[PDB]
Each structure stands twice: as structure tokens, then as C-alpha cells.
Amino acid sequence: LAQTASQTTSSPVRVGLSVDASALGHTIPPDYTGLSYEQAQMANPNYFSGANTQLAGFLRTLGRQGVLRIGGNTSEYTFWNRHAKREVITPEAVNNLSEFLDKTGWKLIYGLNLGKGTPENAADEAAYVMETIGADRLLAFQLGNEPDLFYRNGIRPASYDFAAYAGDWQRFFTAIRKRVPNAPFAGPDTAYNTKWLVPFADKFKHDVKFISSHYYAEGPPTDPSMTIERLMKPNPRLLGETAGLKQVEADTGLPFRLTETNSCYQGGKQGVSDTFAAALWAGDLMYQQAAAGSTGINFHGGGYGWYTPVAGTPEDGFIARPEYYGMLLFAQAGAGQLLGAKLTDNSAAPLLTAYALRGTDGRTRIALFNKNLDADVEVAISGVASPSGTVLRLEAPRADDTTDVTFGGAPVGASGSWSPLVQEYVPGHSGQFVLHMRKASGALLEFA
Numbered sequence: 001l002a003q004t005a006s007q008t009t010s011s012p013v014r015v016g017l018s019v020d021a022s023a024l025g026h027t028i029p030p031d032y033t034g035l036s037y038e039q040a041q042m043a044n045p046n047y048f049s050g051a052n053t054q055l056a057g058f059l060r061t062l063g064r065q066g067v068l069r070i071g072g073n074t075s076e077y078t079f080w081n082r083h084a085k086r087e088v089i090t091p092e093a094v095n096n097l098s099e100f101l102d103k104t105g106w107k108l109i110y111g112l113n114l115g116k117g118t119p120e121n122a123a124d125e126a127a128y129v130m131e132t133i134g135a136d137r138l139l140a141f142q143l144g145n146e147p148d149l150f151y152r153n154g155i156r157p158a159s160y161d162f163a164a165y166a167g168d169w170q171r172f173f174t175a176i177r178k179r180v181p182n183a184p185f186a187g188p189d190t191a192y193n194t195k196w197l198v199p200f201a202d203k204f205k206h207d208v209k210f211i212s213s214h215y216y217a218e219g220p221p222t223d224p225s226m227t228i229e230r231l232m233k234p235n236p237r238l239l240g241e242t243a244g245l246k247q248v249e250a251d252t253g254l255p256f257r258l259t260e261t262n263s264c265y266q267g268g269k270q271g272v273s274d275t276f277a278a279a280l281w282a283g284d285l286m287y288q289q290a291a292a293g294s295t296g297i298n299f300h301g302g303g304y305g306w307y308t309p310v311a312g313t314p315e316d317g318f319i320a321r322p323e324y325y326g327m328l329l330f331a332q333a334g335a336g337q338l339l340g341a342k343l344t345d346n347s348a349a350p351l352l353t354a355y356a357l358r359g360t361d362g363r364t365r366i367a368l369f370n371k372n373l374d375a376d377v378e379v380a381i382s383g384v385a386s387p388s389g390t391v392l393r394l395e396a397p398r399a400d401d402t403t404d405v406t407f408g409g410a411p412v413g414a415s416g417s418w419s420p421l422v423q424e425y426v427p428g429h430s431g432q433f434v435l436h437m438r439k440a441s442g443a444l445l446e447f448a
Contacts, residue, residue: 001420001421001422001423002409002421002422002423003423004409004422004423004424005424006424006425006426006427006436007393007424007436007437007438008436009376009377009378009436009437009438010376011376012375012376012377012378012436013345013346013348013349013372013375013376013377013378014345014377014378014380015343015344015345015346015349015352015377015378015379015380016343016344016345016346016379016380016382017341017342017343017344017354017366017368017379017380017381017382018340018341018342018344018381018382018383019339019340019341019356019364019366019381019382019383019384020339020340020341020342020356020383021339021358021364021383022340023339023340024337024338024339025291025337025338025339025340026290026291026292026293026337026338027335027336027337027338028290028335028336028337028338028357029295029296029335030063030064030065030335031063031065031066031067031106031107031296032063032066032286032290032294032295032296032297032330032335033062033063033065033066033067033286033296033297033327033330033331034063034066034067034068034069034106034259034296034297034298034299035059035062035066035067035068035069035298035299035300035301035309035310036069036070036071036072036259036260036261036298036299036300036301037068037069037070037072037300037301037302038070038071038072038073038074038075038302039070039071039072039074039075039078039087039089039111039113040072040074040077040078040087041070041074041302042070042078042087042089042093042094042097043078043087043088043089043093044093045090045092045093045095045096046096046314047314048068048070048093048096048097048100049096049097049099049100049314050096050099050100050102050103051096051314052100052314053103053415054312054314054317054318054414054415054416055100055310055312055314055318056100056103056104056415057414057415057416057417058309058310058318058320058324058412058415058416059104059106059416060103060104060105060416061328061331061412061416061417061418062309062324062327062328062331062416063106063331064105065105065106065107066104066105066106066107066296067106067107067108067109067139067257067296067298068100068101068104068106068107068108068109068298069108069109069111069259069260069298070097070108070109070110070111071109071110071111071142071145071189071259071260072111072145072260072300073145073146073153074087075111075112075113075115075142075144075145076113076114076115076116076144076145076150076153076155077113077115077116078111078113079113079116079117079121080113080117080121080122080124080125080128082124082128089125091128091132094128094129094132094133095132097132097133098132098133098134098137101133101137102137107137107138107139108129108133108137108138108139109139109140109141109142109186109212109259109298110129110133110138110140110141110142111141111142111144111145111189112125112126112141112142112143112144112172112176113125113144114143114144114147114168114169114172115144115145115147115150115153115155115156116155119171119172119174119175119176120175122143122172122175122176123172123175123176123178123179123180124179126141126176126179126180126183127179127180129141130180130182130183135182135184138184139184139186139209140184140185140186140208140209140210140212141176141183141184141185141186142185142186142187142189142212142259143168143169143172143173143185143187143189144165144168144169144188144189145189145190145260146189146190146191146214147160147165147168147188147189147190147196148165148188148190148191148193148195148196149190150165161195162195162196162199162200165188165196165200166199166200166203166204169187169188169200169204173185173204173207184208184209185204185207185208185209186208186209186210186211186212186257186259187200187204187208187211187212188200188211188212189212189214189259189260190213190214191213191214191215191216191241192213192215192240192241192242192244192245194244197211197213197244197245197248198244198248201248201251201252201254202251202252205252205253205254208254209254210254210255210256210257210295211245211248211249211252211254211255211256211257212256212257212259212260213241213245213256213257213258213259214258214259214260214261215238215241215258215260215261216261216262216263216264216265217230217231217235217238217263217264217281218263218264218265218269219237226263226264226269226272227272228271228272228275228277228373228399228400229373231263231272231277231278231281232277232280232281232351232371232372232373232399232440233351233371238288242289242292242294245294246292246293249293255293255295256293256294256295257294257295257296257297257298258289258294258296258297258298259298260298260300261285261297261298261299261300262299262300262301262307262323263278263281263282263307263323264306264307267303267305267306267307268305268306268307268308269306269307270306271400272306273305273306273307273323274306274307274321274322274402275322275399275400275401275402276322276325276396276398276399276400276401276404276405276440277322277371277399277400277440278307278321278322278323278326279322279323279324279325279326279329279394279396279405279442280326280369280370280371280394280399280440280441280442281323281326281371282299282309282323282326282327283325283326283327283329283330283367283369283394283442284326284353284369284371285297286326286327286330287330287338287353287355287367288353290338290355291338291355299323299327307323308321308323309321309323309324309327310324317414318415319412320411320412320416322396322401322402322403322405324412325394325405325406325407325412326394326442328407328412328418329367329392329394329407329442329444330367332392332407332408332444333357333359333365333367333444334357334359334360334361334365335359335360336357336358336359336360336361336365337357337358338355338356338357339356339357339358339364340356341354341355341356341366346377348375349370349372349375349377350372351370351371351372351373352368352369352370352371352372352377352379352437353368353369353371354366354367354368354369354379355367355368363446363447363448364384364386364446364447365444365445365446365447366381366384366443366444366445367442367443367444367445368435368437368442368443368444368445369442370437370438370439370440370441370442370443371440372439372440373399373439373440374439375439376436376437376438376439377436377437378434378435378436379434379435379436379437380432380433380434381426381432381433381434381435381445382431382432384433384447385431386428386447386448387428387448388425388428388447388448389425389426389428389433389445389446389447389448390423390424390425390426390445390446391424391425391426391435391443391444391445392407392408392409392420392422392424392443392444392446393406393407393408393409393422393424393437393441393442393443394406394407394441394442394443394444395407395438395441395442396440398440399439399440407420408420408421408422409421409422410422426445433445
């Protein structure tokens with residue numbers, strides 16, 4: 001830990017941030033964080049394996065609790081075979097996934113093949129997963145990924161609608177529950193919509209534990225193309241879909257989890273998804289959705305995909321990509337209850353976001369994302385009474401950098417190793433604090 005003088009900017013937008021400890025928001029659960037991977041990865045039993053110490057380390061750094069979701073479009077192409085040693089999942093791969101979950105302490109959401117597989121094979125796969133992973137670590141099975149898009153791959157004919165999917169879902173559910181009477185489910189594993197997710201919740205609310213939603217900041221290929229500038233801005237589709245999920249929860253009692261998300265779909269967009277801007281986007285998204293009452297999040301990744309939080313292979317090793325650093329800020333903040341944090345005088349720095357948290361350890365934290373690409377900010381923080389605040393900064397020299405990303409003055413190292421190397425106090429005077437932030441940067445404040 002090197003002592004760093006309090007950072008200042010030259011011509012910052014001067015904004016106010018007022019924390020209100022009486023303005024109680026949602027309590028972030030300890031297993032809020034998570035990752036999503038393609039089910040095809042289970043064709044390689046070395047990937048989710050107790051031998052894959054590197055990857056397990058990266059997950060542990062993201063959270064002592066969290067959820068690993070395995071699914072995606074490859075779940076319609078991935079077939080369980082009890083009889084084995086298009087992709088195939090073997091008992092070995094399931095065995096090894098159990099050891100991986102033990103090393104990480106994360107829980108599992110596990111996709112079953114409703115698009116092309118049989119109910120009986122899903123039941124057999126579910127039975128083996130329940131046998132080996134066990135009820136404590138298995139959070140939910142999911143019956144197909146994005147069934148509303150089955151038609152775009154010819155997985156279903158263009159006529160496939162909710163009524164056809166409900167029939168499928170029920171056939172699979174019934175078969176699985178004969179083999180696994182305690183099998184938990186979530187669904188429908190797609191983006192919020194009125195023709196699929198709403199009726200799914202109404203029909204199957206007694207049969208699922210939670211609603212599973214997807215979200216990509218990139219819209220349809222028709223909507224304006226995704227850029228860093230757009231990724232930093234509010235997404236009205238997100239706000240609307242989230243409100244939809246909250247109304248489903250009110251109507252059905254089902255909580256929601258964002259079980260597949262990233263900046264751009266289909267592996268991501270080079271020069272957006274693989275950049276420091278994705279750290280700012282992802283960290284801010286985690287808090288935005290937590291403040292909206294989501295139970296958690298799973299950022300999609302794998303391989304060396306543009307959007308993957310963690311890149312690499314067991315043979316070559318794994319590294320933290322820029323987006324991982326946004327998740328790391330959330331991890332270091334820890335869980336607790338969100339508080340009111342109102343920004344003022346901020347029209348000239350409108351993409352700055354801030355979240356205040358009463359941590360489970362009783363300390364106040366504030367996560368700030370200065371997503372303004374061209375405005376530094378100077379934040380006058382009121383409503384916090386503390387003798388000492390420290391800041392850990394989330395930084396890169398340019399918003400589009402693919403590397404050079406640090407948090408707390410350090411990169412993440414091998415196997416998820418991270419500790420802060422720069423100590424910076426937040427200047428305090430008259431019961432207030434003043435924090436400078438560069439354009440396109442993040443900060444985590446912790447008050448004693």
C-alpha cells in the first residue's frame with residue numbers, strides 16, 4: 001500500500017452527492033454476483049474442474065458467494081450421455097463441475113436441452129446433476145435458453161409460440177420431477193417480453209423458484225449500433241424491462257435474476273465489449289439492477305470472447321478482461337443495504353452514477369461510476385459522518401483501452417489474485433467530503 005496524494009482534476013463539473021441513511025433501498029444478497037457460460041463448455045471436463053484452480057480463483061475474487069450459470073444457445077446442441085467418456089456431456093464432466101463448485105463456493109444454474117433433447121434425457125441429466133452436485137449447490141435447472149428465439153435457428157418452426165413452449169416446458173418438468181422430485185427450476189431464460197415471460201410467470205409460478213431474464217445493452221441489429229458513447233448512457237429498454245420484472249414479482253411472488261447479460265450479444269463487439277468502458281458499464285449495471293430489486297446477475301462469457309469477464313483456457317491460463325474490474329469493484333464493496341444517494345448540479349456530467357451502501361460490516365460505502373467520457377467531476381459528498389474515508393479507483397488511460405485497467409492501483413494477477421496497492425484518503429471538511437474523478441473512471445469509497 002503506497003500513500004497517494006488526493007487526486008484533483010483541472011476543470012471538473014462540481015456536483016453534489018447527498019447520502020440519506022434513512023432512504024432504505026434493497027438489501028444486496030451475498031450471492032448477487034455471477035457469471036454465465038455456454039453449456040458446450042461442459043464438453044471439456046477440464047474446464048469446470050477442481051483442477052482448474054486458475055478459473056476458480058477468478059470466481060472467488062468476484063465473490064465468496066455467487067452463481068455460475070451454464071446455458072446459452074449451445075444448450076440446445078449439448079447432449080448428456082451417461083454412456084460416454086453437437087456436443088456431449090459425460091458423468092465425468094458433471095463430477096468435475098461439482099468439484100469446481102466446491103472450490104469456488106458458488107451455486108449453479110444448469111441448462112437442460114429442451115430445444116433438441118428429450119424429456120427423458122433431461123430427466124436423466126437432471127438426476128445425475130442432483131446426485132452429484134446436490135440440492136444445496138444446485139439453485140435451478142432451466143428448460144431451454146431464449147425459447148422465443150428458437151425459430152431464428154430453426155430449433156422450432158416460425159409458428160412456435162408461448163402455448164407451444166408451455167407444452168414443452170410442462171412435458172420436461174413432469175419428466176424431470178419423476179426422476180428428481182425436489183428439482184428446482186427457473187425460467188424462461190429470455191429477455192423480458194409480454195408474449196413469453198409474462199405468461200410464463202403466470203402459468204408456472206408454483207413450479208419455479210425465480211424468473212430468469214436476459215439483457216444485452218445492444219438492441220436489435222436495426223436499433224442504432226452500440227458504441228462506447230451509447231453504452232455509457234441510460235438504456236430505456238432496460239428500465240422498462242426491469243419495471244416489467246418488478247410487476248411480475250408483485251403479481252406472482254417470483255423474484256428475478258438476470259441470468260445472462262453482457263454489453264453486446266454474440267460474443268460481444270470488438271472495441272466496445274472488450275474495453276474499459278465495459279467495466280464502468282458492468283459495475284454500474286450490477287448496482288442499477290440491485291437497486292431495482294434483482295436477486296443477482298450473470299455476465300456471459302467464455303473462451304476469448306470480446307465480452308468475457310475472464311478469458312483463457314486451462315492449458316494457456318486465464319486472465320481478467322476489463323469488464324472483470326467492474327465486477328471486482330462490486331465484490332470489494334460487499335453486500336449490505338442500498339441507501340439514498342441523490343446527485344445535484346450534475347446536468348453537465350449526466351452519466352455519473354452513484355450508489356450508497358450500508359455494508360453488512362456497518363460501514364458506509366459509495367460506488368461511483370463517472371461514465372462521462374469528456375467530463376471530470378468533483379463530488380461534494382454530504383450525509384456521511386466519518387473520521388476517515390478511503391477511495392479505490394477503477395481506472396484506465398482511455399475508455400476504449402483493452403488493457404491498462406487497474407482497481408485500487410493494481411491489476412488482477414494470476415488466478416484472480418488482487419489486493420489494493422494505492423491508499424488514497426478522501427479530503428474531509430465541515431462533515432463533508434470532496435472526491436475528484438477523472439472522466440471515464442470509477443471509485444469505491446469506504447468510510448470508517
